[PDB]
Paper text:
AMPA glutamate receptors (AMPARs) mediate excitatory neurotransmission throughout the brain. AMPARs associated with TARP γ8 are enriched in the hippocampus, and are targets of emerging anti-epileptic drugs. Here, we present high-resolution cryo-EM structures of GluA1/2 TARP-γ8 AMPAR complex, associated with three diverse TARP-γ8 drugs, differing in size and potency - LY-3130481, JNJ-55511118, JNJ-61432059 (herein referred to as ‘LY-481’, ‘JNJ-118’, ‘JNJ-059’), occupying the same binding pocket. Modulator selectivity for TARP-γ8 is determined by two residues unique to γ8, Val176 and Gly209, in the M3 and M4 helices.
Author numbering:
A (entry chain B), D (entry chain D): 395 to 549, 570 to 819
B (entry chain A), E (entry chain C): 388 to 547, 565 to 773, 778 to 815
C (entry chain J), F (entry chain I): 16 to 53, 77 to 186, 196 to 234
């Protein structure tokens, strides 16, 4: 028996030193160890054989011939095919698959989130915008209440000086006048407490922000990726993923197909390497759609700047093939079932993907040596300051010109 | 040219008796994922089917001594039923005696935890960094400082000053908030008092800011397990499993380190983390308030997550990979057609549509779907309420001051 | 009015003294679970001197507190020994009560010997010192209750002590103002 | 063949279900599995035979007779031993040991550090005492310099008011007077900057202290342990540890022996359980000297509040013994080395010490919900405040009396 | 009744040529741990010994094809030498052909890292939380704010105020330090300027405090590896090993997960973490500044840690357990006496004394021996220096003001 | 003296203008490694308009800076597009130089038309506005250099711009004081 295969890492890849003592060790991969295990279980000798035509088994409409590993099996060139061959209806009508040895589906690859460049007005981040607006409203209200109280029940505190007192209190600067009546003093004391709490909270939450980094993915599913339009989609220009979107009746994938067809420039790529590169380039504006196993493989390969997000959109399985009427299908099926029950396939999956992993674990590192704050972190407050200075100049000139008349 | 007997089991949502059971009879009395799947399979194969239920009410299994197959598997082997449209897991022993189809569902062992609820921070949570004892002792120390300042500033006849009791209270309050007032003590005694009060306020306010920072930083580094390894390493959370089932099989016969460790912790525990039934595990997770994690089939976890109450969540990926399939007896004529129909339905999206319908569309929760750590108005609401109340009290006191002075 | 001011001062002194004595001698300062009466323990209302559990067959049984359940250097171990000694003695609450009594005595004696006005000043000083002793006492009490999530609560003896502090400060203010009025009149 | 053995966890413990279906599995432990594994290589049948006495072999001076499992081997009652029996000269002169299957020595056991109750004046912790003294010196110096500058080169600022200004500046309270001259303003500016930096540093380091707890062991060796005397030294009343200290000529252990003989009351314990209990209740004031294996075992036992520190003060080995002349001696000697090279002994060590650890890893839980500050954390500043108030009262009365005359 | 030839190898401190090699000959030419150990062994056994060095300069090993033992083991097997007093590890293959004694030293694989030095915090490290760009832009914004305030407060003829340029500078400086001055603006323009400056200062100072807190908190949670597992999990630190030796044997033939992972990382690396010689590994550790961890015998690690330079530290416990022993030929008469002598010396403490002498007493570092995280005067020294300089400059300026006004 | 004050104002205006023009047109603002000239890159002294690398065969070769090495919404992408546009245009340094020139023109014209005193006020306003534009310019420059441990340093054009700011503020103060003296004299 000769086991047909195909070149697609990490399933089949040339050995580190294949020229020397090539034998059967010129090839290594997940499929190779799998073939070893199932030949041991089936009690047969196996000699590997790459397929002449790289294209995975398919059937031409006009010719009606099968080109690939399927062609090799159906036409007697090979007995068995141990490769990531997807189980499909048309492909089963001619050969007998086994029970899946790995289950997979369509999944989303995104650029790994990284510290984004701080934006002007990021100094407001520790507090929610609603707190800021309520702070402004409270400033107006406290100034107005103090003015009313001072005017109606005097023991100095006009609206202008009332606003000045409140602002100086909020900034921990003190004023040149303080209330002398019980009501004004109640107002002042309560405003003072408010300012103390609010400023302590701002400083504390800023310390929290600067101590621990916590990045959040823009998307976590296809639905989330479906509704928005900021990020762009992407599939191989010819494959099962594009067909699945093309033929789908589920609303989300119908919308996805609509966007992918309409969108210009074209989102489709010619090769998966092109897709991963485009993902790595767009700095988080590109999301590729591909098979889950490849996505995990890449995620565990350097430069380690991509991740899989969400659950698989579809369900599919990879199964060992065999031509109709053969004798190896029945034992290899029970073989794969036995391996799954024992834990062998899980062990190989962990050992080829996670172990042998150029990248690290999920928690590769933490508690990064914090960096000094940069001007870009506080540039907005500089801009605000300079604008206020210009506004003060303008106001003064306006007053001077008015008094000149 | 005959009706085929389709065995089945009662398990939500796969098959379950319809609400109007009395009105309907035959196949029409049942509803679920697998009745409609059987309908589609029959349509694709063009055979008339009579649906029935397994008497044993359980899935296939072999008695050790008797060597007799029970449940739906026994029905198929002994000729009682022709097809088995149900969540019958594909296993080595079963596949030997019956002909499975290709999977119509992929699943595995998965984790089930108490849902992280949207906690209400609490009005007056801005006092949390300091114990109420500190706050109240602060109030009483403020009173004492004011009184002592007034005394040491006004008792001496040679001065009779500006440091009356009211202005002493005002000075002390402004000192605490680090907002000076129009008056400062000029004597040595008043200045000693002011100095100690100033030191006190400095320490107290720095402590408040620092402990609030600690609170928020710690709340910002909390990470849920999100996986089995995270679950395994920690021991705070107790994670159970059904005493009898393929889950215990998987964990005992598991060569992988983390699953072996999980078994070691499960067997070595008191009270027994394990539960007799799945309803028991679900209620235990709900009651224990995050202290319990239940390991079970992914499909049931998803269904439960969609049932009312909505207080449970699935985390992580499936630990292992399995599959449900339609089974027929060895040598049957429906094996090939059934497998082709299953694949036809899978490609067409029929199975995904049925899954969505019976898991989500019928879902009581009915909700497939903002981490910022920025402080919200709920975190500082009490101080706003105090502000409003103080302004109201100030207007009221001004009104009183106006009514007074009527003469 | 001077007369009503003195009357309020004296009434407040006597009320504060009574409140403080009651607080010292009632045993309802703290509510908690102890395990000295039947894992978490049994509900019991502790106090300043004795602890009284109210669950089980030992209902209404009041057993003395010891204040020394461990081993430490009797001569001078650390600040904890001094803290436990002060907490056991309760010299600060007692001192506050004593000073309030003396202040009331001085206030009453001011009615006679009306020529002398420094008596009221001494009374105010005593009241203020009593308030300070009360504050130290409560700080010691609360600090010494710290073991190292058991729910606890405070009773009415605690709040009676607080009222005593407040009234002491009030009557100290009144006495100082009275002394000021007297001195100004003689001028 | 019959393997002699002793009852000592985790080497021998009664099986969980020995009452029913005892079979040969009534006894389980590290040494039982080891005996099984070695008899596998030796090719012999083994039946466990716990010597009736629980004593490890020893020889009586008057009788000149051997009692224990050593007595069993020497007198022919047994064919082999597997129990943990240290290799020593006297026992080797009568029986033949194997190469050690675990190496150990004397080690220290201390209660695991825990958060101690905060002390009064713990609010000074974030800053070193030298910073506080230099702060006081800087306050004096800046006040004096401002005073001199205001007197010599005036443009209000006496020494008293100079000190008041400096104190108000350090506490962020302002003042009723500010300098008008360039020199005084330079002094004020540098003082202001100093205060800003120092107070920010205090708050920041306090936040650091309160957000990550960091417990440090008082002792990390036997030298450091011997130098101090706050902690006491425990050795079983009769054992090899006590005799080792008695015979020792190394300086540190001579000091330790002197201490233990002189110290009152008895630091010795009559049993190991007593020593572990004394460690667990003495709130970190007891250190027990025992064997490293038992210490490591206990470190994974509930309530899990004790730990091993430092290294080992001696070198010893456990070796499976045989009666002199036996054919088993050489095969077992080769077997122990075989297992050591393969990793079986390490596997069993982890199995019976770390696995089945009632405790967890080095850190099962971290970053717990931080606790609100308690009065005991800030009680010293309350005491300082009240003392200052009393001092102010006293000073006022003193001035009143002096100005009366 | 004859002299026994004791083979040996040159390896510090076990055996090494004395400084005055020319003056001395024979046994007296050598010094070290093992020469004195052999002296003690001979005394306990009462035999006269002539010491010799192994010609091969290497420890025993068997050629695969030739099946010939090399080194000391070869000398013993072939009758060349009677005893081998040296750090000859006890192994299965050797023990078969020679008779080992009980170990005189216990050791194992251990971790060797760059020593954590006492870092100097740096004068003017109090500016680290903010970049120098922020500080300098603050200075220039201060100048600009002062000038604009002076302008908008004094240009109008109708006022000619108290806000001259000098007092504007003073007001702005006090605003930045959150210390008000005796004057506040009364006009709308001056108040706008003051408000924006106040906001700026608030944000900047809160940022300084917060980032300093972050710095110190992060410096307070840093944990060195202290173990192999900590070393394994992280990938920042590269950990090597000698290309040829029992260490590589141990890591390749290791069933344990962490050692297998260590081998996986070591083989899969570029540049090759491994080194040709141990001196290479030591120098690489010293140069790489914490990026390299060397795995080697514990004894050599300790000796190196005690040699000059003192910039290397051993961390963790020994990964595996081995032992050195005195070896003799099979059937020799010295096996029993030698084993008894070794045990005698171990019990008497002779071996521990020799270890301390030749590892520590002769140690260049000669130092067997306060984590607080509290800030030290070195952390805030620059601000003290600024204070002193400002006081001096103030004295000088007062002197100038005094010389001026001479008329 | 009024005359020397005006002379200093004019000299400072011209010096500030010259310093700012030189800073704009010298290309020695920043020293760093770029990789636009031959992994870490080659030493190069950048500027405000062009970057000139000084290592390798491309010695003395000054190539223009682009300010747009990525893809962004030309119409309105975000604040980064506006920042890069302002940095590329360098309208703020140029505006500061223009305003300094106009202020000097006004100061010189004040010598004639000596009756009018608002000319000096306009000159001071222009100087202060020039300083503010300089500050905005440097903030923009520094912010736009942030990539997202490469050592960098600043050259003498940078510090010339700083000197220009300082002198502009100084001469603005002098002009305002001159206007004040003139107005007071007419009173
Ligand atoms: O049988 C089939 N097995 C396949 C297996 C893989 C992989 F699993 F990676 F080996 C891949 N792609 C190659 C890299 O880009 C993404 C996935 C395509 C496969 N296709 C073509 P499809 O029809 O478009 O799915 C088949 O037909
Ligand atoms: C970093 C900037 C600080 C520079 C401080 C230098 C002091 C300059 C003071 C100039 C005052 C001269 C004018 C006095 C008041 C006036 O005439 O308006």
């Amino acid at each position: 028996v000769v086991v047909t295969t195909i070149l697609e890492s990490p399933y089949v890849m040339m050995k580190k030193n294949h020229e020397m003592l090539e034998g059967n060790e010129r090839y290594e991969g997940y499929c190779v160890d799998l073939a070893a295990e199932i030949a041991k279980h089936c009690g047969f000798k196996y000699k590997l054989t790459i397929v002449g035509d790289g294209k995975y088994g398919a059937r031409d409409a006009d010719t009606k011939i099968w080109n690939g590993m399927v062609g090799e099996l159906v036409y007697g060139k090979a007995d068995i095919a141990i490769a990531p061959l997807t189980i499909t209806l048309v492909r089963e009508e001619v050969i007998d698959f086994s029970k899946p040895f790995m289950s997979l589906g369509i999944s989303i690859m995104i650029k790994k989130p990284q510290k984004s460049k701080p934006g002007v007005f990021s100094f407001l981040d520790p507090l929610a915008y609603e707190i800021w607006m309520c702070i402004v409203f409270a400033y107006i209200g406290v100034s107005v209440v103090l003015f009313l109280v001072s005017r109606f029940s005097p023991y100095e505190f006009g609206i202008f000086n009332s606003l000045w007192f409140s602002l100086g209190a909020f900034m921990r600067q003190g004023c040149d006048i303080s209330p002398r009546s019980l009501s004004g003093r109640i107002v002042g004391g309560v405003w003072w407490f408010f300012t103390l709490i609010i400023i302590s909270s701002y400083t504390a939450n800023l310390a929290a922000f600067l101590t621990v980094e916590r990045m959040v993915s823009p998307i976590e599913s296809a639905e989330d990726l479906s509704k928005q339009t900021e990020i762009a989609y992407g599939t191989l220009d010819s494959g099962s993923t594009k067909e699945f979107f093309r033929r789908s009746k589920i609303a989300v994938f119908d919308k996805m197909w609509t966007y992918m067809r309409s969108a210009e420039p074209s989102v489709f790529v010619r090769t998966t390497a092109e897709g991963v590169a485009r993902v790595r380039k767009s700095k988080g504006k590109y999301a590729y759609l591909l098979e889950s196993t490849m996505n995990e493989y890449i995620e565990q390969r350097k430069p380690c700047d991509t991740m899989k997000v969400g659950g698989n959109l579809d369900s599919k399985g990879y199964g060992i093939a065999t031509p109709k009427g053969s004798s190896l299908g029945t034992p290899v099926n029970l073989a794969v079932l036995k391996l799954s029950e024992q834990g062998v396939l899980d062990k190989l999956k962990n050992k080829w993907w996670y172990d042998k992993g150029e990248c690290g674990a999920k928690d590769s590192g933490s508690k990064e040596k914090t960096s000094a704050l940069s001007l870009s972190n506080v540039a907005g407050v500089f801009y605000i300051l300079v604008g206020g200075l210009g506004l003060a100049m303008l106001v003064a000139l306006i007053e001077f010109c008015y008094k000149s008349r | 040219n005959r009706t085929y007997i389709v065995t089945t089991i009662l398990e939500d949502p796969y098959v379950m008796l319809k609400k109007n059971a009395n009105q309907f009879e035959g196949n029409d009395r049942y509803e679920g994922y697998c009745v409609e799947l059987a309908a589609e399979i029959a349509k694709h194969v063009g055979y008339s089917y009579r649906l029935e239920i397994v008497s044993d009410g359980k899935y296939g299994a072999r008695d050790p001594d008797t060597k007799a197959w029970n449940g739906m598997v026994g029905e198929l082997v002994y000729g009682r039923a022709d097809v088995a449209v149900a969540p019958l897991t594909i296993t080595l022993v079963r596949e030997e005696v019956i002909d499975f189809s290709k999977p119509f569902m992929s699943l595995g062992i998965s984790i089930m935890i108490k849902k992280p609820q949207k906690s209400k921070p609490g009005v007056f949570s801005f006092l949390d960094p300091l114990a109420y004892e500190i706050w109240m002792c602060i109030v009483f120390a403020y009173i004492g400082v004011s009184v002592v300042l007034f005394l040491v500033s006004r008792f001496s006849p040679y001065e009779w000053n500006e440091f009356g009791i009211f202005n002493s209270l005002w000075f002390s309050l402004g000192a605490f908030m680090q907002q000076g007032c129009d008056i400062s003590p000029r004597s040595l005694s008043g200045r000693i008092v002011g100095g100690v009060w100033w030191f006190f306020t400095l320490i107290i306010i720095s402590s408040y800011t620092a402990n609030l920072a600690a609170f928020l930083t710690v709340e910002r580094m909390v990470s849920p397990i999100e996986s089995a390894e995270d679950l395994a390493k920690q021991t705070e959370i107790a994670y159970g499993t059904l005493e009898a089932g393929s889950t215990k099989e998987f964990f005992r016969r598991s060569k992988i380190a983390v699953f072996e460790k999980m078994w070691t912790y499960m067997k070595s525990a008191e009270p027994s983390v394990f539960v007799r039934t799945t309803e028991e595990g679900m209620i235990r997770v709900r009651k224990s308030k995050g202290k319990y994690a239940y390991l079970l089939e992914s499909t049931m976890n998803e269904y439960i997550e969609q049932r009312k109450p909505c207080d449970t969540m699935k985390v992580g990926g499936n630990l292992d990979s399995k599959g449900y399939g339609i089974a027929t007896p060895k040598g049957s004529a429906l094996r090939g057609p059934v497998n082709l129909a299953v694949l036809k339905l899978s490609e067409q999206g029929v199975l995904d549509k049925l899954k969505s319908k019976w898991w989500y569309d019928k879902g009581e929760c009915g909700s497939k779907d903002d981490k910022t750590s920025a402080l919200s108005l709920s975190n500082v609401a009490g101080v706003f309420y105090i502000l409003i109340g103080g302004l109201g009290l100030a207007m009221l006191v001004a009104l009183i001051e106006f009514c007074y002075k009527s003469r | 009015e001077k007369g009503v001011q003195v009357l309020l001062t004296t009434i407040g002194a006597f009320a504060a003294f009574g409140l403080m004595t009651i607080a010292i001698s009632t045993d309802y300062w703290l509510y908690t679970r102890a395990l000295i009466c039947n894992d978490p323990g049994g509900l019991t209302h502790s106090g300043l001197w004795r602890i009284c559990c109210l669950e089980g067959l030992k209902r209404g049984v009041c057993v003395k507190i010891n204040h020394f359940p461990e081993d430490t250097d009797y001569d001078h171990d650390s600040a904890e020994y001094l803290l436990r000694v002060v907490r056991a003695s309760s010299i600060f609450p007692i001192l506050s009560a004593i000073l309030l009594l003396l202040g009331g005595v001085c206030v009453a004696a001011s009615r006679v010997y009306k020529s002398k006005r420094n008596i009221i000043l001494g009374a105010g000083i005593l009241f203020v010192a009593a308030g300070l002793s009360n504050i130290i006492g409560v700080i010691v009490y609360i600090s010494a209750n710290a073991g190292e999530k058991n729910h606890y609560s405070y009773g009415w003896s605690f709040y009676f002590g607080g009222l005593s502090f407040i009234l002491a400060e009030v009557i100290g203010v009144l006495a100082v103002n009275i002394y000021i009025e007297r001195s100004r009149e003689a001028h």
